[PDB]
Structures are given as C-alpha cells and as structure tokens.
DNA sequence: GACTAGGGAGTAATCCCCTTGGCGGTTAAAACGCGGGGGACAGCGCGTACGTGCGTTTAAGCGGTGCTAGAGCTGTCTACGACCAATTGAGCGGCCTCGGCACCGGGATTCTCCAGGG
C-alpha cells in the first residue's frame, strides 16, 4: 500500500477571446434604407 | 425526591427537480456572383438674366431741441402659504377570465410586361 506509486490522491486544485467585433450587415442596412425611401443606392454607403 | 412518557427541534438521509457544459439536426437569413440594362455624366450651345459703368434723385445720419409719460425705489399692511396628524377613501398590488388581436386562406380586384400588329 505505502510502497509503490499510483493515482489515488485526487488532486490539489489549480486553474485547470474577449476582443469582440462589430456586427450589422449589408441586408440590414438595405432594409433600413428601403424604410427611408430610396429608389437606388450606390456601393459606398454601408 | 427518582425516574417516565411524549413531541418539536437537532441531525441526517431521500428525493428530486434544476441546471452547467458539449454536440447534432434543420430551417432562415445572410453571402456571393452574372446579364443586362438604366442612371450618371461628359461636350456643347445658347440666350437671357443678371454683372457692371454712369446719370439723377430720396433718405439715414447728422446736429440739435423741448419737453412727457412710463420705469425704479421708498414705506406699509394683510391675505395667504408652509409649519403638526386623523382620516378614509382614491387607488394601487395580485388574480381570472373570454374577447380582440394574430395571422393565414379563397376570392375578387387590381397593377404591371410583352410582342406583335394597328
């Protein structure tokens, strides 16, 4: 029992991305534009 | 006075409902790409409507005046508003409906495109 080694001692207890990116999207902006009453838009608005 | 009997708290075991993570399935929204066409914009011409020079006058600033009715401060009082609580009802805290809202279908109605002739 005392002599030898083996895993029967449980453990002591150790320890064992928060950057985030902006959302929104082109279809959402397009829907918002259509709410604002625009017939045609260019490609630099978003 | 010595020991006895019973029940809610102290200790403890049961249940068991409640969630922490990960992972797969599946629909919806987002992502990407092409033909073609309508919107953007150059080149230009012009005319006519202002941009500008000069004559000929009314008018704001000028220079001053003689006051005149409305504005600031001096008392002064007195009608009224911010100081306790009993109240007691105007109204809010929690629950239980059935009805208007949610939303989709059949249809009438209506809005739009084309390839031709008319």
UniProtKB/Swiss-Prot annotation:
The modification N6-butyryllysine is found at residues 8, 12. Residues 1-13 have a biased composition (Gly residues). It comes from the Eukaryota. The modification N6-succinyllysine is found at residue 26. It is found in: Nucleus; Chromosome. The modification N6-acetyl-N6-methyllysine is found at residues 5, 12. Residues 1-16 are annotated as: Disordered. The modification N6-methyllysine is found at residues 5, 8, 12. The modification N6-acetyllysine is found at residues 5, 8, 12, 16. Core component of nucleosome. Nucleosomes wrap and compact DNA into chromatin, limiting DNA accessibility to the cellular machineries which require DNA as a template. Histones thereby play a central role in transcription regulation, DNA repair, DNA replication and chromosomal stability. DNA accessibility is regulated via a complex set of post-translational modifications of histones, also called histone code, and nucleosome remodeling. Present with 524000 molecules/cell in log phase SD medium. The nucleosome is a histone octamer containing two molecules each of H2A, H2B, H3 and H4 assembled in one H3-H4 heterotetramer and two H2A-H2B heterodimers. The octamer wraps approximately 147 bp of DNA. Histone H4 is a component of the UAF (upstream activation factor) complex which consists of UAF30, RRN5, RRN9, RRN10, and histones H3 and H4. Belongs to the histone H4 family. This is Histone H4. It comes from Saccharomyces cerevisiae (strain ATCC 204508 / S288c). The gene is HHF1. The chain holds residues 2 to 52 of 103 of the full protein.
